[PDB]
Design a protein around this ligand. Structure first.
Ligand SMILES: O=c1nc2c(n3ccnc13)=Cc1c(-c3ccccc3)cccc1-2
Ligand SMILES: O=c1nc2c(n3ccnc13)=Cc1c(-c3ccccc3)cccc1-2
Ligand SMILES: O=c1nc2c(n3ccnc13)=Cc1c(-c3ccccc3)cccc1-2
Ligand SMILES: O=c1nc2c(n3ccnc13)=Cc1c(-c3ccccc3)cccc1-2
Lengths: 463, 467, 239, 464
């Protein structure tokens, strides 16, 4: 969306520093700042050096004004390139994504992939945690937390006023029960100001400590950029107002997980490919195959989709979790749900409900698109839909319903075995997958695995 | 009433940035989500909004009447109450309290007895500074406190370190003393302002009254459904006025032991082709043939009716045999211990109504109001005659001459059984479904009656540890 | 007398070693209750009256009728047996507590369970499992025996014994088993209704029983009822 | 002999007798009866109780011990659970399972006695506290001697920090004052010798910082298991009585030693050892070889009984080289099975299974091991080549062919759920018992730990 446009923004707004941003492999953004003067034409054509060593080239589409910086700052995202060969670095997620958009163009099946994500998050007043030789602990807190019901007085001394208990009847009570109304307002304002579009099905929902704002869809790469931006604005708006946000799958035990339902659809020559009045749920064979690709590769898809150890405290056989490998229109417990849109072809999409916000959105959306394209290119048929509720059906008839693996170590094992569908088009390279597998095993899987669980003592000190 | 167009005017004049989509849960706690102002166009009134809570997905349709500017949100927010429909069939959801009241108001018309049922409810509440409580395996506790609480006469300093300045104790004489005994004057006025600015009408028999921690403000009547809408708004505004002044409110039936209960009195009337039915000098008190038959209906149905008018386990710490609590099934002109009570309307035709004295605010105003009107109508159908009025005292009149004055049931688990055993007048017209009531019977049993029943009371320790 | 003694000795041994004991039927929520399992037999001329091999579970025709008397008068018998408000926090439908008005040799869930004693005529007895130590052992034993006798005199035949599992037996097939009342106020109302098996022979007097009722109502039932439960705040402060 | 015990009860002026018996996962249960009530009729008729409904309890005279901790003079005896009507050993009493194993061992004519000796490590702390709430979870153990306390200004009781704490380079078993628990361990050893444990040549009290171990003489399978139970009871209580608190949990300390139970085994017939053969390896007959063959073959499921806790697998990890390598050796501490150097003496010859931990039920652990051992003989299962070189330092493609034990309790439970015939042979283990054990572990241990966030997850992921 034109270098010259970004230069207009720089002037109208009177920008004085530019925040160069880029994405580390496990998916936390990185930044440094240059003065506005040092940002010009030559930045877009040549790039910027930085440190091993990297050449950074900017994406004109991702330019945003920073609501939080005291100086007037414009943030832009960049693709990492190798300074010698000038060629897109292999393990830059923004590139893994860009190659995925381009692969989709070469197949000639469709030209654009539209992603839309619904990312939930927790708001807390404080968190502390710590692992030692002889002990370990964590504790999150918040004023409105139902476990603070018999509190003498609050954190800051002020009297305990009640209105905390997660009650019965609904999930989204009005104030004073809704104790973070004004915070979510600020967030939504900051999102609307930072150019997020909010139309029909888009809203701010708030269930006590947990909240969700959804915005309009976007093209795969830019959907992911939006997703990193959303997180950034949500986190910092809480930060700037004395709170602390976490997107982690399962911070509260015996309460709700924080999911990310991803809506995907394919378009070509300016028309939707997912609609067909005649087929089930109004789904065309292209869509049905795509779903079949997702359900076939789910076991290895979850490696990027739900890539933390914490992820599998949410995806656990119990809560009616999106772990059942079928598609549906009803079932919440099914992996792929289809949103009831109607006779409108433009809205017809499919919602993959397993993912969580803990992943790298660039690799996640890509991994999904790759799995779906595999479904299309191999005409895979998904096992028939399941519309009547799953909790009420014979134990044997419902034993034909396969499950997602329930551990990080497993999905990582599975990614290791079958990852062929990801190597297509030079998107995920066999190198990068080795790295993703090693990275998780060495830095997550096993360092968690060697540390005794607090609850283990409950069970076993007495033995 | 006001059309959709006025709502897009209000929003625009006020410079609303967000619109609050409110709908009611089954027990009667408002639910909401927020959408930007720009996303609130005319298609909202025609096509509706989607969201998801057997049911899964749901279509929500706005009520142009209930649009109000939130005084409390920092962002400029307009609130509108919605009806729940079937996304596919456009059919009202049989379990949506506002729908239920809608059905009630239509049914009334489908009988031709009248066209409009009016309600207006004086609802009482408590203001506290603090509340804490908690249930564990090896014990329980609760404690409300407030600065003006009489149990705090001996305090050395107040909570904020400030000296104790007296003027607390509940006295003998009257219930509504002036400052400084009335410590909650500025807060109550603030509440009043907020209700006035949020559009409530205060006129004749309408007042703000302050009895210690307990307080009450009564506002103008409204048609059954919109009366209940008003009822919600009223709680919201009190609650949130308190909250933003660092206090805490509660509408529960009995927060304090050995002290007053919080009670919601519902005045009913009926109207047709612009005129009131209830009036007629030639009969008792001013009551017409229909008015009396109505009253009969309330009285014959009370044991099941209470299941909606007096829902909570806490509802029956107010309604106790002794306190002169409205448990007696007769109508009256003088008795505060009587279920129905005809107010001194000074025989002008329009003001003739009847006040039900039993229900508390701890309910679902939609269902309550609806089920009340349902009882009153069945009473009109079978021309049901209510036992003779009682104008002489109940506290003092021969013990075996007034023995056959019947009593409402005094437990929750009791009244629910009456409901599970007789619910026809409610299902008449499909106003209440049988499916709805079955769940509300089950609610209630699982979620209220049973978990209370299985927890030891602290006082059981006073009684029994030593045994 | 032994029972009062036991209690006293238990309480005081603890008290003397810096602790504190309680026989209240349910002191901990979501944990076990303290019950009193009562074994009964009748004897004549130094020889037991309860044994018979050709009858069910080794019972005599005396023993069976006796049982019928307990189960028919249980709704009233509990007013002495389980005479406190706190008793019904133990005898609530849920924990599968001994509430089902049937007799067994298997069930932990029935009021009367016959102790497996095999072929010894002396050792055959009946264990009435509902009572708690919160009552008066004098009045409680008394009323058990009194109800047991009205069963022999009138020859009450108790419905079929159930060895089969009370936790899993078809929802409408076992919907034909009477429960005890689940509230003190109930068993009191039901003692006021029928208490004839008690005043037979002038053992319990109509007066005594009338005091007991007024004692339980005005000193226990009513003062608990008018006092708000902490869990009510958990339920309703928000309304 | 029954009569020994009555004279024991008499001589020691015993006033109470402790009726003991083993629950399913492995903690002993008890009720006390007066000494007056304990007579000839106990050993003949039995004793009645309930846990299913009513059960009969029959005493094992061998297990009779004076209780050194109870102030009232008390005698502890273990019992076997029987059905009151049929007089049938109960299908589920671990002590019966051990008994029944010992008999099946005779029924095959393979050997008549199965000898088990156990070296069970333990930890001594001054305090433990923990809990798991909705918004939080924690644990902490502490010991004044602990190397994390080097910088403490004062101790718990206020007296000054005197040093001599930190795990130091070169030595695992230092002398005092580094050995801060010398007088406690002594009391422990005294209490065992007093309680009828036998200590001889290879038997010794060792003490590694806060971890400690005391071996005692072998016994026949059932009694070995009884001893193990007893050994735990005395260790635990000896500390308890001295204001300390002990744990047999496999892995209480992150970044430190795990506690293991090494299980020495051998078989005998007609009073002749079956394990020796001067024709190698390590002087091992084919009986001994096939036994090992079975151990190593069934190890993937055997661990659901030898290492049956979620904690067990924080010790058994591909880390410090914990005994997870499916080979037998003479050198590697990282081998599952190892043969102790006995040299020429044919009676000392045995095989040491090194994976097990004391978080177990020894009756089941020991039975499961022997059952696996016999299937090894009956099927002449041949175990893969004995590794005598280093496991941590060898060509990666020649060490890739070395199989590993499963790394997680969830797995071994499943592996047990797949093949477990070798256990059900002769009716030692019933399919009924094994099933309960699976449901038990899955629903009570595997599933509850799983759904509870780990504190280090907040370290990794709060910032995601
Ligand atoms: O006009 C459009 N309308 C829609 C759209 N789209 C992509 C390109 N042009 C359009 C995409 C779209 C979705 C959608 C599709 C996939 C993922 C998320 C949202 C839902 C409702 C309506 C639309
Ligand atoms: O002019 C009126 N004046 C009154 C009225 N009403 C309904 C329609 N028009 C009127 C209704 C009304 C009540 C009333 C009726 C029912 C419930 C509560 C108040 C009391 C006093 C005065 C009025
Ligand atoms: O030898 C006797 N053995 C018993 C007995 N009894 C009464 C008079 N003589 C005897 C009474 C008795 C009971 C028993 C009977 C009723 C209530 C409680 C215990 C239980 C077991 C054994 C006996
Ligand atoms: O004389 C013996 N010497 C020994 C023995 N044993 C059992 C029966 N008789 C003997 C068993 C034994 C072991 C041994 C065997 C298995 C497990 C632990 C120790 C070690 C050294 C010496 C012996």
């Amino acid at each position: 969306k034109t270098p010259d446009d970004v230069f207009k923004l720089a002037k109208d707004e009177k920008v004085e520093y530019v925040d160069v941003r880029f994405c580390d492999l496990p998916g936390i953004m990185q930044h440094f700042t240059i003065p506005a003067s040092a940002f010009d034409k030559s930045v877009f054509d040549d790039g910027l050096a930085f440190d091993s060593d990297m050449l950074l080239l900017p994406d004109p589409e991702t330019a945003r004004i920073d609501p939080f910086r005291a100086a007037k700052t414009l943030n832009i995202n960049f693709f990492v390139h190798d300074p010698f060969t000038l060629e897109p670095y292999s393990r830059d997620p923004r590139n893994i994504a860009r190659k995925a958009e381009n692969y989709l163009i070469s197949t000639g099946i469709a030209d654009t992939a539209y992603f839309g994500a619904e990312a939930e998050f927790y708001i807390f007043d404080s968190v502390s945690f710590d692992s030692r030789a002889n002990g370990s602990f964590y504790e999150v807190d918040a004023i409105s937390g139902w476990w603070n019901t018999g509190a003498a007085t609050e954190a800051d001394g002020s009297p305990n006023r009640g209105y905390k208990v997660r009650h019965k009847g609904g999930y989204f009570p009005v104030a004073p029960n809704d104790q973070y109304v004004d915070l979510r307002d600020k967030m939504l304002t900051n999102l609307i100001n930072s150019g997020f579009i909010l139309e029909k099905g888009h809203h701010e929902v708030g269930s006590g400590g947990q909240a969700e704002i959804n915005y309009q869809f976007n093209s795969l790469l830019h959907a992911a950029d939006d997703m990193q931006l959303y997180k950034y604005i949500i986190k910092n708006t809480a930060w700037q107002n004395g709170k602390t946000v976490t997107f982690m799958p399962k911070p509260l035990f015996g309460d709700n997980g924080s999911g990310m339902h991803c809506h995907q659809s394919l378009w070509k020559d300016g028309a939707p490919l997912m609609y067909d009045e005649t087929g089930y749920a109004g789904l065309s064979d292209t869509a049905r195959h795509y779903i079949g690709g997702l359900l076939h590769h789910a076991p290895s898809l979850l490696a990027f989709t739900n890539p933390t150890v914490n992820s599998y405290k949410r995806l656990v056989p119990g809560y009616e979790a999106p772990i059942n490998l079928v598609y549906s229109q009803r079932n919440r417990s099914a992996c792929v749900r289809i949103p009831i849109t109607g006779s409108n072809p433009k809205a017809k999409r499919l919602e993959f409900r397993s993912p969580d916000s803990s992943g790298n959105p660039y690799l996640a959306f890509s991994a999904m698109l790759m799995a779906g394209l595999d479904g299309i290119k191999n005409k895979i048929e998904p096992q028939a839909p399941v519309d009547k509720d799953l909790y009420e059906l014979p134990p044997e008839e419902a034993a034909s319903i396969p499950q997602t693996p329930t551990q990080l170590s497993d999905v990582i094992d599975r990614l290791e075995a079958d990852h062929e569908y990801l190597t297509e088009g030079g998107v995920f390279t066999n190198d990068l997958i080795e790295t993703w597998i090693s990275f998780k095993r060495e830095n997550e899987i096993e360092p968690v695995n060697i540390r005794p669980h607090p609850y283990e003592f409950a069970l076993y000190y007495d033995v």
